[PDB]
Amino acid sequence: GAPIHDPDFIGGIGKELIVDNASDVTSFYPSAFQEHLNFIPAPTTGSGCTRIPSFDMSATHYCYTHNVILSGCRDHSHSHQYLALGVLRTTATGRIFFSTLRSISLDDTQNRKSCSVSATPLGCDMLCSKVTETEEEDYNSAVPTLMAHGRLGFDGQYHEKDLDVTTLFEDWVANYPGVGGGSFIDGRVWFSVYGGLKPNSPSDTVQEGKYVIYKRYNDTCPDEQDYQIRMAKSSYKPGRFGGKRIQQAILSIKVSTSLGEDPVLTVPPNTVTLMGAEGRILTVGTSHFLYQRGSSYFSPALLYPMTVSNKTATLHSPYTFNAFTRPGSIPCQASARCPNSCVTGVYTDPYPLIFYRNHTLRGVFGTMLDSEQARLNPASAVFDSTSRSRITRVSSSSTKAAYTTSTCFKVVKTNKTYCLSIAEISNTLFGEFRIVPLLVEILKND
Amino acid sequence: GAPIHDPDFIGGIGKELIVDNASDVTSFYPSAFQEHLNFIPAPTTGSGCTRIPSFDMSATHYCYTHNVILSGCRDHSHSHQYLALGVLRTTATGRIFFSTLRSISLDDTQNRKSCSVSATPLGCDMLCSKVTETEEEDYNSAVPTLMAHGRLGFDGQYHEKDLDVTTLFEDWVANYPGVGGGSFIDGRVWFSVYGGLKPNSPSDTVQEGKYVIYKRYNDTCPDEQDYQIRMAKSSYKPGRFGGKRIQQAILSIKVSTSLGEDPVLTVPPNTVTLMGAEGRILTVGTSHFLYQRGSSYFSPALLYPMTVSNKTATLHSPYTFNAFTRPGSIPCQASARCPNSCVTGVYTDPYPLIFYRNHTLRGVFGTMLDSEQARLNPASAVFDSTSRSRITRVSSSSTKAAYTTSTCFKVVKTNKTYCLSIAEISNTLFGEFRIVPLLVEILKNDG
Ligand SMILES: CO[C@@H]1O[C@H](CS[C@]2(C(=O)O)C[C@H](O)[C@@H](NC(C)=O)[C@H]([C@H](O)[C@H](O)CO)O2)[C@H](O)[C@H](O)[C@H]1O
Ligand SMILES: CC(=O)N[C@H]1[C@H]([C@H](O)[C@H](O)CO)O[C@@](O)(C(=O)O)C[C@@H]1O
Ligand SMILES: CC(=O)N[C@H]1[C@H]([C@H](O)[C@H](O)CO)OC(C(=O)O)=C[C@@H]1O
Ligand SMILES: CC(=O)N[C@H]1[C@H]([C@H](O)[C@H](O)CO)OC(C(=O)O)=C[C@@H]1O
Ligand SMILES: CC(=O)N[C@@H]1[C@@H](O)[C@H](O)[C@@H](CO)O[C@@H]1O
Ligand SMILES: CC(=O)N[C@@H]1[C@@H](O)[C@H](O)[C@@H](CO)O[C@@H]1O
Ligand SMILES: [Ca+2]
Ligand SMILES: [Ca+2]
């Protein structure tokens, strides 16, 4: 009885979209942006701050959420979340439109932040942190960040349960969802999570001495090997948050009428993962991936293959897309090639788009910020390990922007492949930002 | 079970909101704009044109729609409509939000234009014209404009039936819905319509020689009496559309599973109505009103009292709000005071807000374009027959805008009055316009 996408999409959601072994990845490219039903609310006042979009779509419905601050993006006192659950549909003319069925403003007195959502068989699951301090202050206070698992049901009602962070995140000083969407796998919902570890705690100790260096395709770091290792190690304890170890983690929760049931946190070894950061758990076909924002020295987009075993997950050496860089402050700018300590960058995920016949990933779609340091010029394109296809731009003029989260699918009825790319774009008259659901069709030269 | 607004709204939709006789209407004014769930889709491309908003809300649900053109606002080849049916709700903190339940893009082989919506017990009824020519070309072709009565049901399905315009609008050369919302009254849905009459037809001949002159509060027109009457008569047949008589009308349709059932057209005498124009049918309390856009020489916002008798309607001398002017090209600019012939102005309606104890309307809320000739600088405020309260501005800087349609309501629990004001505002990067649902609370000078 639950909602489902129109018949035109059945079988075209969350699967390997393009399988070719001959064609060059970059022979595929995005069309000009397309006009479709903008399902994302824009601000209604001059100061309203709408930011931090999260989106996930299963074979039956999609979920979306973003944060809203009344006075501006700088205010940290209180805020509310917009939540939407809907399904994909097509017009009589074959035009797609995300048709939301449940649209609500979640505003009590709790300050939910850095929320991630995931489409599960019971509706739209959301994981958020509840803050009573600034991020800097959070990392400075020994106790972990409070968190809650909530869900917007098909009936439009929202229910949630606060997680026992004192136990679940006993070894952490701060912990937040990765904002990127979560994914439903084997009866459990999986969320990317990150934060700071309590020094000398068991979690901190096991990571002691663990690091991993990922390099730029055709740009070797000149520094002596011993120095790179030194910097690689320190990259996990950047100065931004008082030298606390910023760790990557994955949280899985059983999906049931009981929210927060049987939570299990997985902390991958830092011999594979770079400094903890925002991220997303993706499922395309039978493959799973952890996207990790390039908040550290590594600029190319990362996708760590992810396999699940019961309630825990295992990550492997990541796929990297050298041309899919992100802006960052020096010495961690887009063109950075050496290990260093920093907490910068921006969330701009890559969606698995092209695969080999044997299911290894070849190319992805994404909207990068085509800039060295400043958060500017959104550019949608198709990427492989080293290059970028022809691009599609929001504007030929200098344009301020931030986060982008892309999800691709296929309209089986028209046999056309599309990619939704939700991007925070600068705005005028109504708030600092406008979260726009950009849409493009994936094309191929000839 | 059909959808319904949250309990906090029961008894706060479509009623006289403020009944006062001892206070000055302008002592009531709008608060600063409030941040709330923006239920109106903005463009997603640089050329996308989202325009022509229509909105209506009943005691159970609200309805909204707007037109979308892919290449820009000047392209008339094809387009589609965005349609939404939803209900009002409140957050845990008591914040209000319009929660849409059915959200669709309606795009087929037909080009629906100038559409109006109305919340009926069966869903969201829509009246549109289906065009295959420019407005100019339409008035030149003798046959009437094709029209259709559609409906977005609670189940999210859209159905429609073309009206037999050859018979229904036999005397017309062009006919469109007034874009403003329609209203459900006594088992029927009522829509404002306007267009041009076929010269010398029965409808045309009966209106020949008929006219009415409405004046500005103080500003008396200096022109000679006989000259004014001549200008007034001519205002009904402006040159823009070749001397055709632009006529105002009201269409009622029976609300049932059968769309377009028993349509009846009412053409009011031009001894009461000014040149035909876009409009809206409003129902507040037991009173009904026809808002008529000031497309002719009259600038002040207009609300004609409307009484219904079975399937037909009767209009009466209108309420006028002298300070609620609208921009227009000379000699029909905001400060115009004399009868004249023109087709200008813009749609910016007034919502009945304050009533006298005996139910006579005293004040309204609306968002005017505070400019003489250019469509600029939106200003939300409360108006009485002669003045305007303090205002709330979209921006202190010069701002391009267009249509505005307002609807007010109340949260009986907190006894707080709110006004939604949907306004077409200029945009950057994504299309020429952004239709924004502005929201204010109605406050009072001294309490
Ligand atoms: C220009 O100084 C600011 O003026 C503000 C006035 S209140 C208000 C207005 O003009 O009415 C409230 C409006 O809702 C608001 N508009 C929107 C869209 O949010 C409007 C604009 O913010 C203002 O006009 C700038 O364009 O302001 C208020 O006193 C501020 O505190 C002043 O700094
Ligand atoms: C928002 C938008 O529609 N962007 C479009 C842009 C802009 O119109 C121009 O860059 C002018 O700024 O033009 C494109 O050809 C491009 O650059 O990729 C297609 C793209 O869809
Ligand atoms: C929990 C929190 O504050 N998240 C913020 C995130 C964070 O600072 C980064 O992941 C480094 O920790 O950065 C930004 C941002 O535009 O970059 C916005 C998020 O609000
Ligand atoms: C049917 C039609 O074309 N409607 C148009 C309307 C019309 O020109 C006017 O009501 C004169 O009749 O004006 C305008 C306008 O922004 O002013 C936009 C509408 O799209
Ligand atoms: C799972 C598997 O067989 N992977 C291989 C990959 O190693 C190889 O590089 C590619 C061709 O070059 O084919 C497949 O993708
Ligand atoms: C129909 C009717 O009785 N209207 C009267 C109106 O004439 C008068 O100006 C006002 C103020 O007392 O009260 C009512 O509105
Ligand atoms: Ca803490
Ligand atoms: Ca015609």
PDB file of N, CA and C in Angstrom, chain A residues 33-38 41-45 48 70 82 91-93 95 97 99-105 107-108 394 399 425 427-430 434 436-438, chain B residues 33-38 41-45 48 70 82 91-93 95 97 99-105 107-108 394-395 399 425 427-430 434 436-438:
ATOM      1  N   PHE A  33      21.039  22.067 -18.320  1.00  0.00           N
ATOM      2  CA  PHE A  33      20.106  21.839 -17.231  1.00  0.00           C
ATOM      3  C   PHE A  33      18.684  21.823 -17.759  1.00  0.00           C
ATOM      4  N   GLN A  34      17.860  20.952 -17.185  1.00  0.00           N
ATOM      5  CA  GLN A  34      16.477  20.810 -17.617  1.00  0.00           C
ATOM      6  C   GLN A  34      15.492  21.355 -16.596  1.00  0.00           C
ATOM      7  N   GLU A  35      14.362  21.849 -17.089  1.00  0.00           N
ATOM      8  CA  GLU A  35      13.329  22.398 -16.225  1.00  0.00           C
ATOM      9  C   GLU A  35      12.421  21.269 -15.737  1.00  0.00           C
ATOM     10  N   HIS A  36      12.239  21.199 -14.423  1.00  0.00           N
ATOM     11  CA  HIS A  36      11.385  20.191 -13.814  1.00  0.00           C
ATOM     12  C   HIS A  36      10.863  20.761 -12.498  1.00  0.00           C
ATOM     13  N   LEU A  37       9.850  20.110 -11.935  1.00  0.00           N
ATOM     14  CA  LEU A  37       9.229  20.545 -10.689  1.00  0.00           C
ATOM     15  C   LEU A  37      10.250  20.704  -9.560  1.00  0.00           C
ATOM     16  N   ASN A  38      10.507  21.942  -9.154  1.00  0.00           N
ATOM     17  CA  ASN A  38      11.461  22.197  -8.079  1.00  0.00           C
ATOM     18  C   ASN A  38      10.828  21.807  -6.745  1.00  0.00           C
ATOM     19  N   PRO A  41      12.085  23.605  -1.226  1.00  0.00           N
ATOM     20  CA  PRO A  41      11.670  24.932  -0.761  1.00  0.00           C
ATOM     21  C   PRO A  41      12.814  25.938  -0.684  1.00  0.00           C
ATOM     22  N   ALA A  42      12.562  27.141  -1.188  1.00  0.00           N
ATOM     23  CA  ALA A  42      13.539  28.222  -1.149  1.00  0.00           C
ATOM     24  C   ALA A  42      13.141  29.113   0.028  1.00  0.00           C
ATOM     25  N   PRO A  43      14.050  29.982   0.496  1.00  0.00           N
ATOM     26  CA  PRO A  43      13.714  30.855   1.629  1.00  0.00           C
ATOM     27  C   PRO A  43      12.546  31.788   1.305  1.00  0.00           C
ATOM     28  N   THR A  44      11.865  32.271   2.340  1.00  0.00           N
ATOM     29  CA  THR A  44      10.747  33.190   2.151  1.00  0.00           C
ATOM     30  C   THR A  44      11.005  34.567   2.767  1.00  0.00           C
ATOM     31  N   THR A  45      12.209  34.767   3.303  1.00  0.00           N
ATOM     32  CA  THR A  45      12.594  36.057   3.883  1.00  0.00           C
ATOM     33  C   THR A  45      14.017  36.398   3.460  1.00  0.00           C
ATOM     34  N   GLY A  48      16.523  34.229   5.959  1.00  0.00           N
ATOM     35  CA  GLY A  48      16.383  32.786   6.073  1.00  0.00           C
ATOM     36  C   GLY A  48      17.527  32.011   5.447  1.00  0.00           C
ATOM     37  N   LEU A  70      16.507  30.870  10.919  1.00  0.00           N
ATOM     38  CA  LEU A  70      15.785  32.117  10.698  1.00  0.00           C
ATOM     39  C   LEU A  70      16.585  33.399  10.493  1.00  0.00           C
ATOM     40  N   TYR A  82      13.418  20.820   7.124  1.00  0.00           N
ATOM     41  CA  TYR A  82      12.347  20.581   6.178  1.00  0.00           C
ATOM     42  C   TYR A  82      12.532  19.116   5.794  1.00  0.00           C
ATOM     43  N   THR A  91       5.243  13.270 -16.754  1.00  0.00           N
ATOM     44  CA  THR A  91       4.108  13.982 -17.320  1.00  0.00           C
ATOM     45  C   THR A  91       3.659  13.160 -18.525  1.00  0.00           C
ATOM     46  N   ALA A  92       2.577  13.578 -19.165  1.00  0.00           N
ATOM     47  CA  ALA A  92       2.099  12.863 -20.342  1.00  0.00           C
ATOM     48  C   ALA A  92       3.167  12.966 -21.438  1.00  0.00           C
ATOM     49  N   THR A  93       3.968  14.028 -21.381  1.00  0.00           N
ATOM     50  CA  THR A  93       5.022  14.265 -22.365  1.00  0.00           C
ATOM     51  C   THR A  93       6.355  13.594 -22.047  1.00  0.00           C
ATOM     52  N   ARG A  95       8.135  14.054 -19.247  1.00  0.00           N
ATOM     53  CA  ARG A  95       8.967  14.894 -18.386  1.00  0.00           C
ATOM     54  C   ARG A  95       8.890  14.385 -16.962  1.00  0.00           C
ATOM     55  N   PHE A  97       9.167  14.500 -12.800  1.00  0.00           N
ATOM     56  CA  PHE A  97       8.925  15.424 -11.715  1.00  0.00           C
ATOM     57  C   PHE A  97       8.869  14.651 -10.416  1.00  0.00           C
ATOM     58  N   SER A  99       7.445  14.092  -7.215  1.00  0.00           N
ATOM     59  CA  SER A  99       6.158  14.406  -6.617  1.00  0.00           C
ATOM     60  C   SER A  99       6.179  14.094  -5.123  1.00  0.00           C
ATOM     61  N   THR A 100       6.369  15.099  -4.264  1.00  0.00           N
ATOM     62  CA  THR A 100       6.395  14.772  -2.839  1.00  0.00           C
ATOM     63  C   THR A 100       4.984  14.565  -2.317  1.00  0.00           C
ATOM     64  N   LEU A 101       4.850  13.580  -1.437  1.00  0.00           N
ATOM     65  CA  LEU A 101       3.574  13.204  -0.846  1.00  0.00           C
ATOM     66  C   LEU A 101       3.437  13.737   0.570  1.00  0.00           C
ATOM     67  N   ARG A 102       4.560  13.790   1.279  1.00  0.00           N
ATOM     68  CA  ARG A 102       4.584  14.283   2.647  1.00  0.00           C
ATOM     69  C   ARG A 102       5.631  15.386   2.744  1.00  0.00           C
ATOM     70  N   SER A 103       5.168  16.592   3.048  1.00  0.00           N
ATOM     71  CA  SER A 103       6.023  17.767   3.141  1.00  0.00           C
ATOM     72  C   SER A 103       5.810  18.435   4.490  1.00  0.00           C
ATOM     73  N   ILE A 104       6.823  18.413   5.348  1.00  0.00           N
ATOM     74  CA  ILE A 104       6.663  19.028   6.659  1.00  0.00           C
ATOM     75  C   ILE A 104       7.856  19.845   7.125  1.00  0.00           C
ATOM     76  N   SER A 105       7.586  20.705   8.101  1.00  0.00           N
ATOM     77  CA  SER A 105       8.604  21.525   8.729  1.00  0.00           C
ATOM     78  C   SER A 105       8.719  20.867  10.092  1.00  0.00           C
ATOM     79  N   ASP A 107       9.857  21.461  13.474  1.00  0.00           N
ATOM     80  CA  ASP A 107      10.322  22.492  14.372  1.00  0.00           C
ATOM     81  C   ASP A 107       9.766  22.406  15.776  1.00  0.00           C
ATOM     82  N   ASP A 108      10.522  21.854  16.664  1.00  0.00           N
ATOM     83  CA  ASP A 108      10.180  21.825  18.069  1.00  0.00           C
ATOM     84  C   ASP A 108      11.231  22.749  18.657  1.00  0.00           C
ATOM     85  N   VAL A 394      26.026  26.335 -14.210  1.00  0.00           N
ATOM     86  CA  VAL A 394      24.868  27.065 -13.721  1.00  0.00           C
ATOM     87  C   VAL A 394      24.923  28.435 -14.387  1.00  0.00           C
ATOM     88  N   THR A 399      29.980  32.382  -9.938  1.00  0.00           N
ATOM     89  CA  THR A 399      28.833  32.059  -9.097  1.00  0.00           C
ATOM     90  C   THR A 399      29.180  31.353  -7.792  1.00  0.00           C
ATOM     91  N   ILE A 425      23.109  27.069  -3.979  1.00  0.00           N
ATOM     92  CA  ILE A 425      23.531  28.166  -4.834  1.00  0.00           C
ATOM     93  C   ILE A 425      23.308  29.497  -4.129  1.00  0.00           C
ATOM     94  N   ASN A 427      22.106  33.229  -3.444  1.00  0.00           N
ATOM     95  CA  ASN A 427      20.820  33.805  -3.782  1.00  0.00           C
ATOM     96  C   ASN A 427      20.798  35.311  -3.560  1.00  0.00           C
ATOM     97  N   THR A 428      19.746  35.951  -4.055  1.00  0.00           N
ATOM     98  CA  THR A 428      19.551  37.385  -3.873  1.00  0.00           C
ATOM     99  C   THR A 428      18.144  37.553  -3.303  1.00  0.00           C
ATOM    100  N   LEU A 429      17.949  38.635  -2.552  1.00  0.00           N
ATOM    101  CA  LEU A 429      16.667  38.984  -1.948  1.00  0.00           C
ATOM    102  C   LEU A 429      16.122  38.049  -0.875  1.00  0.00           C
ATOM    103  N   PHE A 430      16.313  36.745  -1.051  1.00  0.00           N
ATOM    104  CA  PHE A 430      15.785  35.776  -0.097  1.00  0.00           C
ATOM    105  C   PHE A 430      16.818  34.814   0.494  1.00  0.00           C
ATOM    106  N   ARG A 434      20.084  29.190  -1.837  1.00  0.00           N
ATOM    107  CA  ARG A 434      18.924  28.604  -2.465  1.00  0.00           C
ATOM    108  C   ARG A 434      19.401  27.192  -2.807  1.00  0.00           C
ATOM    109  N   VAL A 436      18.998  24.284  -5.005  1.00  0.00           N
ATOM    110  CA  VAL A 436      18.342  23.967  -6.262  1.00  0.00           C
ATOM    111  C   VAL A 436      18.532  22.551  -6.797  1.00  0.00           C
ATOM    112  N   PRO A 437      17.426  21.890  -7.153  1.00  0.00           N
ATOM    113  CA  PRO A 437      17.555  20.534  -7.682  1.00  0.00           C
ATOM    114  C   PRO A 437      17.822  20.646  -9.179  1.00  0.00           C
ATOM    115  N   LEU A 438      19.096  20.628  -9.554  1.00  0.00           N
ATOM    116  CA  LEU A 438      19.471  20.718 -10.957  1.00  0.00           C
ATOM    117  C   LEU A 438      19.226  19.366 -11.604  1.00  0.00           C
TER     118      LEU A 438
ATOM    119  N   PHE B  33       8.120  40.053   7.002  1.00  0.00           N
ATOM    120  CA  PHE B  33       7.862  38.759   6.382  1.00  0.00           C
ATOM    121  C   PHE B  33       8.385  37.641   7.278  1.00  0.00           C
ATOM    122  N   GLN B  34       7.634  36.547   7.337  1.00  0.00           N
ATOM    123  CA  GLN B  34       7.987  35.406   8.174  1.00  0.00           C
ATOM    124  C   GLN B  34       8.545  34.233   7.372  1.00  0.00           C
ATOM    125  N   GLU B  35       9.481  33.511   7.977  1.00  0.00           N
ATOM    126  CA  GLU B  35      10.091  32.367   7.324  1.00  0.00           C
ATOM    127  C   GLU B  35       9.169  31.172   7.516  1.00  0.00           C
ATOM    128  N   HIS B  36       8.756  30.562   6.413  1.00  0.00           N
ATOM    129  CA  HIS B  36       7.878  29.403   6.485  1.00  0.00           C
ATOM    130  C   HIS B  36       8.114  28.514   5.271  1.00  0.00           C
ATOM    131  N   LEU B  37       7.600  27.290   5.329  1.00  0.00           N
ATOM    132  CA  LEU B  37       7.764  26.311   4.255  1.00  0.00           C
ATOM    133  C   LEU B  37       7.301  26.855   2.907  1.00  0.00           C
ATOM    134  N   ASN B  38       8.250  27.114   2.015  1.00  0.00           N
ATOM    135  CA  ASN B  38       7.922  27.647   0.699  1.00  0.00           C
ATOM    136  C   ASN B  38       7.321  26.541  -0.166  1.00  0.00           C
ATOM    137  N   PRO B  41       7.185  25.969  -6.153  1.00  0.00           N
ATOM    138  CA  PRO B  41       8.379  25.636  -6.936  1.00  0.00           C
ATOM    139  C   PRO B  41       8.979  26.816  -7.712  1.00  0.00           C
ATOM    140  N   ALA B  42      10.296  26.975  -7.605  1.00  0.00           N
ATOM    141  CA  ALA B  42      11.020  28.022  -8.325  1.00  0.00           C
ATOM    142  C   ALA B  42      11.648  27.367  -9.562  1.00  0.00           C
ATOM    143  N   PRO B  43      12.086  28.168 -10.547  1.00  0.00           N
ATOM    144  CA  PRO B  43      12.700  27.605 -11.758  1.00  0.00           C
ATOM    145  C   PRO B  43      13.965  26.798 -11.465  1.00  0.00           C
ATOM    146  N   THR B  44      14.307  25.889 -12.374  1.00  0.00           N
ATOM    147  CA  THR B  44      15.502  25.064 -12.223  1.00  0.00           C
ATOM    148  C   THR B  44      16.504  25.275 -13.361  1.00  0.00           C
ATOM    149  N   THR B  45      16.209  26.231 -14.240  1.00  0.00           N
ATOM    150  CA  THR B  45      17.083  26.548 -15.362  1.00  0.00           C
ATOM    151  C   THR B  45      17.177  28.063 -15.506  1.00  0.00           C
ATOM    152  N   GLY B  48      13.875  29.225 -17.636  1.00  0.00           N
ATOM    153  CA  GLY B  48      12.554  28.818 -17.185  1.00  0.00           C
ATOM    154  C   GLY B  48      11.668  29.960 -16.715  1.00  0.00           C
ATOM    155  N   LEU B  70       9.338  26.800 -20.863  1.00  0.00           N
ATOM    156  CA  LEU B  70      10.746  26.419 -20.878  1.00  0.00           C
ATOM    157  C   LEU B  70      11.750  27.451 -21.375  1.00  0.00           C
ATOM    158  N   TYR B  82       1.914  23.782 -13.060  1.00  0.00           N
ATOM    159  CA  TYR B  82       2.259  23.114 -11.838  1.00  0.00           C
ATOM    160  C   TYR B  82       0.998  23.185 -11.010  1.00  0.00           C
ATOM    161  N   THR B  91       3.745  23.381  13.431  1.00  0.00           N
ATOM    162  CA  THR B  91       4.881  22.647  13.979  1.00  0.00           C
ATOM    163  C   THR B  91       4.636  22.507  15.472  1.00  0.00           C
ATOM    164  N   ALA B  92       5.531  21.807  16.164  1.00  0.00           N
ATOM    165  CA  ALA B  92       5.390  21.633  17.605  1.00  0.00           C
ATOM    166  C   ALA B  92       5.451  22.992  18.300  1.00  0.00           C
ATOM    167  N   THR B  93       6.206  23.918  17.720  1.00  0.00           N
ATOM    168  CA  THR B  93       6.360  25.250  18.285  1.00  0.00           C
ATOM    169  C   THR B  93       5.227  26.192  17.880  1.00  0.00           C
ATOM    170  N   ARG B  95       4.425  26.925  14.730  1.00  0.00           N
ATOM    171  CA  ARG B  95       4.701  27.597  13.466  1.00  0.00           C
ATOM    172  C   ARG B  95       3.826  26.994  12.381  1.00  0.00           C
ATOM    173  N   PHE B  97       2.713  26.024   8.481  1.00  0.00           N
ATOM    174  CA  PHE B  97       3.308  25.659   7.211  1.00  0.00           C
ATOM    175  C   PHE B  97       2.260  25.049   6.296  1.00  0.00           C
ATOM    176  N   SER B  99       1.375  22.424   3.955  1.00  0.00           N
ATOM    177  CA  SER B  99       1.831  21.071   3.664  1.00  0.00           C
ATOM    178  C   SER B  99       1.097  20.499   2.448  1.00  0.00           C
ATOM    179  N   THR B 100       1.779  20.482   1.309  1.00  0.00           N
ATOM    180  CA  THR B 100       1.198  19.980   0.074  1.00  0.00           C
ATOM    181  C   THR B 100       1.140  18.451   0.064  1.00  0.00           C
ATOM    182  N   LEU B 101      -0.008  17.919  -0.346  1.00  0.00           N
ATOM    183  CA  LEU B 101      -0.241  16.476  -0.391  1.00  0.00           C
ATOM    184  C   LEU B 101      -0.116  15.895  -1.797  1.00  0.00           C
ATOM    185  N   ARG B 102      -0.540  16.668  -2.792  1.00  0.00           N
ATOM    186  CA  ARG B 102      -0.458  16.252  -4.191  1.00  0.00           C
ATOM    187  C   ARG B 102       0.250  17.366  -4.958  1.00  0.00           C
ATOM    188  N   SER B 103       1.392  17.029  -5.546  1.00  0.00           N
ATOM    189  CA  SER B 103       2.210  17.989  -6.276  1.00  0.00           C
ATOM    190  C   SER B 103       2.500  17.454  -7.671  1.00  0.00           C
ATOM    191  N   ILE B 104       1.940  18.067  -8.717  1.00  0.00           N
ATOM    192  CA  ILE B 104       2.179  17.566 -10.062  1.00  0.00           C
ATOM    193  C   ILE B 104       2.504  18.618 -11.106  1.00  0.00           C
ATOM    194  N   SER B 105       3.105  18.115 -12.179  1.00  0.00           N
ATOM    195  CA  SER B 105       3.381  18.873 -13.359  1.00  0.00           C
ATOM    196  C   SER B 105       2.395  18.319 -14.383  1.00  0.00           C
ATOM    197  N   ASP B 107       1.547  18.315 -18.110  1.00  0.00           N
ATOM    198  CA  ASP B 107       2.058  18.642 -19.429  1.00  0.00           C
ATOM    199  C   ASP B 107       1.695  17.569 -20.448  1.00  0.00           C
ATOM    200  N   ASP B 108       0.836  17.935 -21.392  1.00  0.00           N
ATOM    201  CA  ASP B 108       0.429  17.018 -22.444  1.00  0.00           C
ATOM    202  C   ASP B 108       0.490  17.753 -23.780  1.00  0.00           C
ATOM    203  N   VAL B 394       9.559  43.868   0.311  1.00  0.00           N
ATOM    204  CA  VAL B 394      10.349  42.711  -0.073  1.00  0.00           C
ATOM    205  C   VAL B 394      11.806  43.154   0.018  1.00  0.00           C
ATOM    206  N   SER B 395      12.078  44.369  -0.448  1.00  0.00           N
ATOM    207  CA  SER B 395      13.433  44.910  -0.407  1.00  0.00           C
ATOM    208  C   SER B 395      13.429  46.425  -0.346  1.00  0.00           C
ATOM    209  N   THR B 399      13.071  46.906  -6.816  1.00  0.00           N
ATOM    210  CA  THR B 399      12.782  45.510  -7.137  1.00  0.00           C
ATOM    211  C   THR B 399      11.669  45.300  -8.149  1.00  0.00           C
ATOM    212  N   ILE B 425       8.213  37.684  -8.145  1.00  0.00           N
ATOM    213  CA  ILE B 425       9.366  38.552  -7.914  1.00  0.00           C
ATOM    214  C   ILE B 425      10.463  38.261  -8.938  1.00  0.00           C
ATOM    215  N   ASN B 427      14.034  37.428 -10.506  1.00  0.00           N
ATOM    216  CA  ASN B 427      14.985  36.451 -10.019  1.00  0.00           C
ATOM    217  C   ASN B 427      16.301  36.612 -10.752  1.00  0.00           C
ATOM    218  N   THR B 428      17.327  35.946 -10.243  1.00  0.00           N
ATOM    219  CA  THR B 428      18.640  35.963 -10.868  1.00  0.00           C
ATOM    220  C   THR B 428      19.034  34.505 -11.075  1.00  0.00           C
ATOM    221  N   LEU B 429      19.827  34.255 -12.111  1.00  0.00           N
ATOM    222  CA  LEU B 429      20.320  32.915 -12.438  1.00  0.00           C
ATOM    223  C   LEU B 429      19.287  31.893 -12.901  1.00  0.00           C
ATOM    224  N   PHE B 430      18.136  31.850 -12.244  1.00  0.00           N
ATOM    225  CA  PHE B 430      17.125  30.868 -12.618  1.00  0.00           C
ATOM    226  C   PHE B 430      15.799  31.456 -13.078  1.00  0.00           C
ATOM    227  N   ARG B 434      10.379  34.395  -9.914  1.00  0.00           N
ATOM    228  CA  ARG B 434      10.315  33.458  -8.811  1.00  0.00           C
ATOM    229  C   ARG B 434       8.984  33.805  -8.151  1.00  0.00           C
ATOM    230  N   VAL B 436       7.030  33.745  -5.080  1.00  0.00           N
ATOM    231  CA  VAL B 436       7.269  33.515  -3.665  1.00  0.00           C
ATOM    232  C   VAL B 436       6.073  33.709  -2.747  1.00  0.00           C
ATOM    233  N   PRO B 437       5.811  32.710  -1.890  1.00  0.00           N
ATOM    234  CA  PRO B 437       4.696  32.772  -0.947  1.00  0.00           C
ATOM    235  C   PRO B 437       5.149  33.558   0.276  1.00  0.00           C
ATOM    236  N   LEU B 438       4.840  34.850   0.282  1.00  0.00           N
ATOM    237  CA  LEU B 438       5.217  35.704   1.401  1.00  0.00           C
ATOM    238  C   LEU B 438       4.207  35.498   2.519  1.00  0.00           C
TER     239      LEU B 438
END
